[PDB]
């Protein structure tokens, strides 16, 4: 009936629509506190790396960027 979407940013079956995408719950909060580019965000490599687990204390910038990649909006 409808393709199953998931945490467009970093997890799995999103609890539902919040930003405008089937995004996560907790990691979703990270995005709320991180919206807007202006931020001292940065990855310990800035090279390449897939974002998944939360921890909200590791690839935080790739997460954010990925969140902006998701195409969300604080809402
Ligand atoms: Zn997530
Ligand atoms: Zn990274």
Curated annotation (Swiss-Prot):
Subunit structure: Binds DNA as a homodimer. Can form a heterodimer with ESR2. Interacts with FOXC2, MAP1S, SLC30A9, UBE1C and NCOA3 coactivator. Interacts with PELP1, the interaction is enhanced by 17-beta-estradiol, the interaction increases ESR1 transcriptional activity. Interacts with EP300; the interaction is estrogen-dependent and enhanced by CITED1. Interacts with CITED1; the interaction is estrogen-dependent. Interacts with NCOA5 and NCOA6 coactivators. Interacts with NCOA7; the interaction is a ligand-inducible. Interacts with PHB2, and UBE1C. Interacts with AKAP13. Interacts with CUEDC2.
Annotated disease: Estrogen resistance: A disorder characterized by partial or complete resistance to estrogens, in the presence of elevated estrogen serum levels. Clinical features include absence of the pubertal growth spurt, delayed bone maturation, unfused epiphyses, reduced bone mineral density, osteoporosis, continued growth into adulthood and very tall adult stature. Glucose intolerance, hyperinsulinemia and lipid abnormalities may also be present.
Remaining remarks: Selective estrogen receptor modulators (SERMs), such as tamoxifen, raloxifene, toremifene, lasofoxifene, clomifene, femarelle and ormeloxifene, have tissue selective agonistic and antagonistic effects on the estrogen receptor (ER). They interfere with the ER association with coactivators or corepressors, mainly involving the AF-2 domain.
Reported tissue expression: Widely expressed. Not expressed in the pituitary gland.
Entry comment on modification after translation: Phosphorylated by cyclin A/CDK2 and CK1. Phosphorylation probably enhances transcriptional activity. Self-association induces phosphorylation. Phosphorylated by LMTK3 in vitro.
The species this protein was found in: Homo sapiens
Zinc finger (NR C4-type): 7-27, 43-67
Residue ranges the UniProt entry marks as DNA-binding: 7-72
Protein name, UniProt field: Estrogen receptor
Functional summary from the UniProt entry: Nuclear hormone receptor. The steroid hormones and their receptors are involved in the regulation of eukaryotic gene expression and affect cellular proliferation and differentiation in target tissues. Ligand-dependent nuclear transactivation involves either direct homodimer binding to a palindromic estrogen response element (ERE) sequence or association with other DNA-binding transcription factors, such as AP-1/c-Jun, c-Fos, ATF-2, Sp1 and Sp3, to mediate ERE-independent signaling.
Gene name as annotated: ESR1
Family: Belongs to the nuclear hormone receptor family. NR3 subfamily.
Annotated domain remarks: Composed of three domains: a modulating N-terminal domain, a DNA-binding domain and a C-terminal ligand-binding domain. The modulating domain, also known as A/B or AF-1 domain has a ligand-independent transactivation function. The C-terminus contains a ligand-dependent transactivation domain, also known as E/F or AF-2 domain which overlaps with the ligand binding domain. AF-1 and AF-2 activate transcription independently and synergistically and act in a promoter- and cell-specific manner. AF-1 seems to provide the major transactivation function in differentiated cells.
Subcellular location: Nucleus; Golgi apparatus; Cell membrane
């Amino acid at each position: 009936m409808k393709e199953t979407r998931y945490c467009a940013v970093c997890n799995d079956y999103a609890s539902g629509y919040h930003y405008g995408v089937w995004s996560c719950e907790g990691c979703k909060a990270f995005f709320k506190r991180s919206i807007q580019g202006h931020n001292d965000y940065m990855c310990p490599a800035t090279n390449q790396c897939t974002i998944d687990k939360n921890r909200r204390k590791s690839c935080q910038a790739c997460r954010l960027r990925k969140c902006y990649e998701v195409g969300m909006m604080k809402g």
